[PDB]
């Protein structure tokens, strides 16, 4: 089996806020997950980070801290909230911080980025988002090429569904960006009756298609569920969805 993560936003923001994120960690371990993705927008709440760290450690889970933070500001400077967010993430027991790109300047100071990352013990993940600045193949390809040149402790999170918001083809993205991918965010996307894009659980067809996309990324890369998980028995549901994802490969 390949390593599987669950983004707790999958369970619904209201439910997660009400029950607290730490309460989902035993559920994830019991369902067979290897990693949890925490969500900054989902603490009620100023968290007991100590209690949260102890919970992750007890379950033997890896932990990704996901933030809506955009790395680069309109003005061309690294987001001053980067270090405060890294501290937050580390305090919660995360091994990775996941962010969006923001607006990549013509001249990014990746040396500066490195120095800030070096003050903390987290690998940085940068995810394609739904915006023009952070969600399009061309600028992301530029960022990852450069980042690799200066050898940053950073990797791409390839979000399968987000490309849809920028009318970018996931297959083309995978072909061009797949060598940089360290984490896959899985969701299916449909256009609803009013023409609006909405994230949904995968069909059997989507899953087979995702297996083909995964051929473009290093074998065994961690894959995350970030789509609705709703049902009366969340443990059994999560287990069945983890198994389906873990099984994707050659």
């Amino acid at each position: 089996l390949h390593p599987v993560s669950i983004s707790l936003s999958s369970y619904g923001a209201d439910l997660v806020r009400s029950r607290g994120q730490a309460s989902f960690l035993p559920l994830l371990a019991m369902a067979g997950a290897q990693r949890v993705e925490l969500r900054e927008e989902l603490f009620a709440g100023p968290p007991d980070t100590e209690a949260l760290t102890a919970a992750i450690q007890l379950q033997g889970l890896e932990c990704v801290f996901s933030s809506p933070l955009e790395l680069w500001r309109e003005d061309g400077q690294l987001n001053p909230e980067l270090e405060p967010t890294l501290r937050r993430a580390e305090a919660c027991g995360a091994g990775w911080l996941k962010v969006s790109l923001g607006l990549l300047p013509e001249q990014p100071d990746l040396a500066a980025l490195g120095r800030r990352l070096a003050r903390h013990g987290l690998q940085l993940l940068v995810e394609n988002d739904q915006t023009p600045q952070g969600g399009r193949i061309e600028v992301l390809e530029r960022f990852f090429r450069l980042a690799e040149r200066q050898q940053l402790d950073l990797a791409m999170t390839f979000d399968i569904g987000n490309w849809r918001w920028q009318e970018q083809a996931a297959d083309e993205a995978a072909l061009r960006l797949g060598r940089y991918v360290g984490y896959v965010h899985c969701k299916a996307v449909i256009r609803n009756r009013d023409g609006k894009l909405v994230a949904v659980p995968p069909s059997a067809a989507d899953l087979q298609y995702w297996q083909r996309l995964l051929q473009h990324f290093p074998e065994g890369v961690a894959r995350a569920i970030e789509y609705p998980l709703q049902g009366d028995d969340l443990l059994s549901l999560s287990r069945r969805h983890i198994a389906a994802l873990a099984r994707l490969g050659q």
Copy 2:
């Protein structure tokens, strides 16, 4: 279940012209179809539009009228056959007229198009065809963008197979044009042993692919059979093909 149409060309041009298109209406209704797509080229002489409209209504079907007319002439003017075809379609009972684009000029008179459409009671549908002028993604994107800006009462018919004639990817077309799609033409396409592209009935794999394409169009969009339906028992065959398409998507 999603609404399903059958294009009567599916039954074979010679057979349909022989028996007449009206004779297939009870078949379509009994087989579970919600619309009939009449084909201008399959009328053996001008129809009694009153008997036709009455037969369609008796069967509780809606009706798309399909013409091979190209909307824009080589010289950049609208095809003068547009309003005569709109009048014939409307008289036969259709809710939509389906046409091809023709050669979109540098400065298309979309206001004049709107004025002509406003004189009739049908929605205009423009389908991708098999030609360079009417069958390539870039020009169709330009057309539908400009039509939406003019707020015209028109939508795309997305023909899954026709892209093959222009060596365009349906997946790419669906990404770029999906927001505009109000009707889907379903057909599988193979290159035969002689080298010629031909429309064929879908395999299981084809249906799964089409399910993924439909994610790009508003959920529950009407879908039409436009591939060969040939056999000893057209009711049974039609019923099965309709059922497979009615439940595609969910």
Copy 3:
């Protein structure tokens, strides 16, 4: 069933070189293949061309001879090794000679190529390779378009996996080049844990995708296993793999 070929490189180059390519023909015929693809690079010494041809004919197999030869030299001239390679292919009983493109010049002498090829019963196939000069859609499309204008009876070997090495989409390749394809090389490609591209046997999803790619090529085109075939029982392994390829197409 559609005709299936096995490229003998599938069995592992060292194993094949040591046993000789002729020793695999009974296996191919018993497992249900229609065609063997011989590999010039898998002859450990000069071939016994008469015994090879006799072994192919005994088994009732057809034969494609694969050469790493590049058709067009850097200086724009046709590779002078083409004639001896065509004769070698014929000596080994081949109905097709498969080569790489090389560097396509601005004004290739396709007329001369056609006159050369017309002296031979076999057909020339040009395969997409893993190089910029021979593995990119645009130049290959230019080659086949020029060949079609000159009315040459040559065709393409569409290698499904090779496109990955040049970061080219196989679906786009199949759309733009499909009309030219007379032979298909099947392999799946993944990035390994180290990030290196490697050719591998297909998953069920791969096979389903390949069925869709085949829609772009003339129906019934011969398709070849060109991916690892390893096991204690090559006969049953080969038979299962040939079967899965032979049934790919429309119902």
